[PDB]
Structure 1
Amino acid sequence: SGIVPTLQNIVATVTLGCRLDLKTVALHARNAEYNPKRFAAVIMRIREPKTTALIFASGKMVVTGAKSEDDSKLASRKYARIIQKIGFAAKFTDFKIQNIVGSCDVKFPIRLEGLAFSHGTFSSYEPELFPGLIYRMVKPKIVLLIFVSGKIVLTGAKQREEIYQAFEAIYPVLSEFRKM
């Protein structure tokens, strides 16, 4: 009603369109974790606009870290200046955002052992397994995590507007199920 989910995390996928050798990429950068026995990728954890990414020897890194969409696009734009300024061709093609995450505090305790009754056709709650209540929403398909205190994780969607609808929709339900 009066609250709107804060983007705490966005995933960005991007293609650079060239099978580029990892060996070299790492040995040219401040943030250079290549462990081919471990992960098959290089790890550059840039400072501004704050990410982590994961470059692949086919040329399609996994940029994870953004707080927004200004960041996530630039985050992945900054590995496109480094890999460029090293020795490779490699463009910036198809910036697709795979995931966005959300959160906030509805500022009151929320019962979960009863939510599993009414809206339990969408729900799965095992108390001592994971204190959260998992809400599988269909329209749109964004997964909510509803904790006892009243804090919600709204990971799932690829558009920001999507996520926000998932908060608005579940609200009159977060209001009905409470500890007065």
Structure 2
Amino acid sequence: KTNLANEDEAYEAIFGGEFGSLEIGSYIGDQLEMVTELLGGIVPTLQNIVATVTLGCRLDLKTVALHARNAEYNPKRFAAVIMRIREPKTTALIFASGKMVVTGAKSEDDSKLASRKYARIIQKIGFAAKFTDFKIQNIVGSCDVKFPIRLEGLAFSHGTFSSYEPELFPGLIYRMVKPKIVLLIFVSGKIVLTGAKQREEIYQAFEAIYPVLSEFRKM
């Protein structure tokens, strides 16, 4: 009963995954591939930022798709226009309602700036679009503690906060409480941090987890 040519169902899909908008690449094109792409004196690094913009006016996606340069619109597959720009290299999903979702940036400034570009593009085509309600919805961070994790022991010891689920992910899924951050922990020591609303939460989730990962070093 999942229809992605529906608008209410296609927007809700981007944020309703197991990992919410971490999975946003599957709607602009594997489960394991989506995570591992987000890797490529230890300090985390921002790998993606998902933002939402309300453009304000009803949009005719056939028109938008026609006049946009690098753009794709198959309304049977997914119910939005897929537009891309080259700097900040990003991707936007533009709905019939003027809602817009903007992914690909790696700074909070690139996210807001890219979003302003997509909005201006849509105006220039000929719409009463105004850039409003810019919110950052998710920030994905990555980390590499550069030493291997005894995941099988961390899964037992922190079973309250952990799962091993090969179907979803080949490593450990750490659901941290404060801050509410899911850490995807690889056996090699690389980590993918998601859920964050501000970058502070990425560093906090990392500072919290580094002493835990140390206790579980494989030697």
Whether TM exceeds 0.5 here: the answer is yes
**1:1-180 map, 5 Å:** 2-126=41-165, 130-180=169-219
Instruction: Please report how far the alpha carbon of residue 130 of structure 1 lies from its aligned counterpart in structure 2 after TM superposition.
Output: 3.3
Report the CA distance shift for 1:20/1:127 in structure 2 as closer, same or farther (over 3 A).
closer
Instruction: Please report how far the alpha carbon of residue 30 of structure 1 lies from its aligned counterpart in structure 2 after TM superposition.
Output: 1.0
| CA shift digits 1:5-51 (9 cap, x unpaired) | 11110101000111111111011011121111111111111101110
Report the CA distance shift for 1:108/1:128 in structure 2 as closer, same or farther (over 3 A).
farther
Does the residue aligned with 2:67 lie in a helix, a strand or coil? coil
Instruction: Please report how far the alpha carbon of residue 68 of structure 1 lies from its aligned counterpart in structure 2 after TM superposition.
Output: 0.8
Quote the Cα distance in structure 2 between the aligned partners of 1:78 and 1:89: 15
| CA shift digits 1:94-120 (9 cap, x unpaired) | 111110001121011111000012111
Q: Which runs of 4+ in 1 moved over 2 A?
A: 126-131
Report the CA distance shift for 1:84/1:130 in structure 2 as closer, same or farther (over 3 A).
closer
Structure 1, unaligned stretches of length 5 or more?
none
Instruction: Please report how far the alpha carbon of residue 2 of structure 1 lies from its aligned counterpart in structure 2 after TM superposition.
Output: 2.5
Instruction: Please report how far the alpha carbon of residue 127 of structure 1 lies from its aligned counterpart in structure 2 after TM superposition.
Output: 5.6
Quote the Cα distance in structure 2 between the aligned partners of 1:32 and 1:126: 36
| CA shift digits 1:51-70 (9 cap, x unpaired) | 01100110011111111111
Instruction: Please report how far the alpha carbon of residue 128 of structure 1 lies from its aligned counterpart in structure 2 after TM superposition.
Output: 7.9
Quote the Cα distance in structure 2 between the aligned partners of 1:128 and 1:63: 28
**TM-score, normalised via structure 1 length:** 0.96
Instruction: Please report how far the alpha carbon of residue 129 of structure 1 lies from its aligned counterpart in structure 2 after TM superposition.
Output: 6.6
Instruction: Please report how far the alpha carbon of residue 166 of structure 1 lies from its aligned counterpart in structure 2 after TM superposition.
Output: 0.2
Matched-pair identity in %: 99
- Name whichever of 126-135 and 96-105 sits farther off: 126-135
**Larger Rg over CA atoms:** 1
Quote the Cα distance in structure 1 between the aligned partners of 2:177 and 2:168: 24
Quote the Cα distance in structure 2 between the aligned partners of 1:143 and 1:44: 29
- Number of equivalenced pairs: 180
| CA shift digits 1:145-164 (9 cap, x unpaired) | 11110000001111000111
Quote the Cα distance in structure 2 between the aligned partners of 1:126 and 1:26: 39
**Bigger proportion of residues as strand:** 2
Instruction: Please report how far the alpha carbon of residue 126 of structure 1 lies from its aligned counterpart in structure 2 after TM superposition.
Output: 3.9
Structure 2, unaligned stretches of length 5 or more?
1-39
Report the CA distance shift for 1:163/1:32 in structure 2 as closer, same or farther (over 3 A).
same
Does the residue aligned with 1:27 lie in a helix, a strand or coil? helix
